[PDB]
Amino acid sequence: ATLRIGLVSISDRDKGIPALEEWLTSALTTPFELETRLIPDEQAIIEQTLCELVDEMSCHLVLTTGGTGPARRDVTPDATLAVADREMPGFGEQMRQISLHFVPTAILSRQVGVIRKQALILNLPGQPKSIKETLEGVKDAEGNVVVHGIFASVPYCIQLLEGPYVETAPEVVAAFRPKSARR
Amino acid sequence: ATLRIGLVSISDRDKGIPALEEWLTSALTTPFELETRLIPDEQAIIEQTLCELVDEMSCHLVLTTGGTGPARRDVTPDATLAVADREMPGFGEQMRQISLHFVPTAILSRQVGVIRKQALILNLPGQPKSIKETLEGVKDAEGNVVVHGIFASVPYCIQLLEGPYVETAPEVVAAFRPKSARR
Amino acid sequence: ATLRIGLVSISDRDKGIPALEEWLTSALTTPFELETRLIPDEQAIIEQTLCELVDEMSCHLVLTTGGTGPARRDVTPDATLAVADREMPGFGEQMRQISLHFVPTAILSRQVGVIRKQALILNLPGQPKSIKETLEGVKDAEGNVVVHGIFASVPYCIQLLEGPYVETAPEVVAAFRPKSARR
């Protein structure tokens, strides 16, 4: 089936939506449709937007960009936890470990991954290069994986959440699944 | 003294209890006694079982297997946090980092380690191979430790919780303790 | 400007204050002033002390030492979360990953990093060697960084919190900042 993805760029004031549209087009080999939103960094508007995308637009996956640091105005993770049914602690932890391979200041991000209804919501960085580094991971000179991107586990997570069967281009990111889940 | 260990296999429907009984028999060199329970994946029955083992059976350690993923029915970590007095964030984090050496999808687990009364409760995976990988860690071809298993810190944690003095077979897992705690 | 730092040694009963005074003197090249407190391990007195330092003494940074393990009396992280406006999950996670390079029992620490008002509060270990290992990280024989210390991100975090411009001696720890924040 078609994967319905919501893309939310949270601007304190856009490069965020465009970076996601480009990366997802290169990575996915199964069909997808986008619902894109560019909004201010105000917590109640981020919460409303996430509920709109999950509840009224029926998105299977929502990726946010921006507003995850320590500063007073950065409230994207707070809005995401407010609308969640359940937290996925491994996603925050591992997005920080992937990002620490690039710079030590990755530990200042408060990004989370949560589930609302059957949708997965992931908070990504505001800079385009960081968005791609997080999703795809760290490879060597010959292209071999050193540390898997966070997207390597997203297709199987959507499958466990009773969503569509998603596949990726192995040259960009390989979609890991156990024998029990492979078609 | 004898270490009293509770083993809980949480079945959505058993290989879980048997994998733990085998590993603990190979790893521990001090005496232990087991209290084993096989139960359905229903949150209130998991909570009741954990309270039974800690409060009425006086277990010093409880190890659970199964029901820690993202799917709607997996509620083992929710039950474990509900009965906890305190969380041990390092145990969830490091069980995920150990498991990431094997597969990238380890970040989909929501496993926790908590304390109830003076007992330590740890959530482990449902598959037998994963149970052993988590407890014992990653070694090289000659058998040298690369990343310590989660059990390397359990004997000292039980000692700090005023429990019995536990020792392990160094060929399986070495029990780390500071000078202040060594007998 | 002058950085105002609070140092809190939480004694269950001192080497903690002195280890911090020595390390900060070697690491910082911009001016700082210290507010030092030696207190018992009782949760309400730790909470009061942290509020005193942030609210009445206007500290930009507070570093605590001691009382972060699993034992019943170790309540430094509980007091720190009680007085927080917001948690910084990356600081707890990465202090544990840095400390795991030395010993596997680092996962028994429940240390956190939080923000109260515009101040950053970090929980460090009770042993002097561990305090320095956490702040400065892991280097090789020639002095090159393997894993950055937790202090490499503190100057930029204080800047994002609208505090003074802090600089460090690169021979001890290099202060990472993006192009947007460098003067």
Swiss-Prot record, chains A, B, C:
* CDD domains reported in the protein's UniProt record: MogA_MoaB
Q: Which pathway features in its UniProt record?
A: Cofactor biosynthesis; molybdopterin biosynthesis
Give a yes or no for keyword RNA-binding in this entry. Answer: no
Entry keyword ATP-binding: yes
Reactions performed catalytically: molybdopterin + ATP + H(+) = adenylyl-molybdopterin + diphosphate
> InterPro entries this protein is in?
MoaB/Mog-like_dom_sf, MoaB/Mog_dom, MoCF_biosynth_CS, MPT_Adenylyltrnsfr/MoaC-Rel
SMART domains, per database record: MoCF_biosynth
Q: Which GO terms describe its biological process?
A: Mo-molybdopterin cofactor biosynthetic process
What's the superkingdom here?
Bacteria
Enzyme Commission number, as recorded:
2.7.7.75
Q: Name one GO molecular function term.
A: molybdopterin adenylyltransferase activity
Q: Which UniProt keyword terms apply here?
A: ATP-binding, Molybdenum cofactor biosynthesis, Nucleotide-binding, Transferase
Q: Do you know which SUPFAM superfamilies this protein is assigned to?
A: Molybdenum cofactor biosynthesis proteins (SSF53218)
Purpose = Catalyzes the adenylation of molybdopterin as part of the biosynthesis of the molybdenum-cofactor.
The similarity comment for this entry is:
Belongs to the MoaB/Mog family.
The protein's name in its UniProt record: Molybdopterin adenylyltransferase
The species is Shigella flexneri
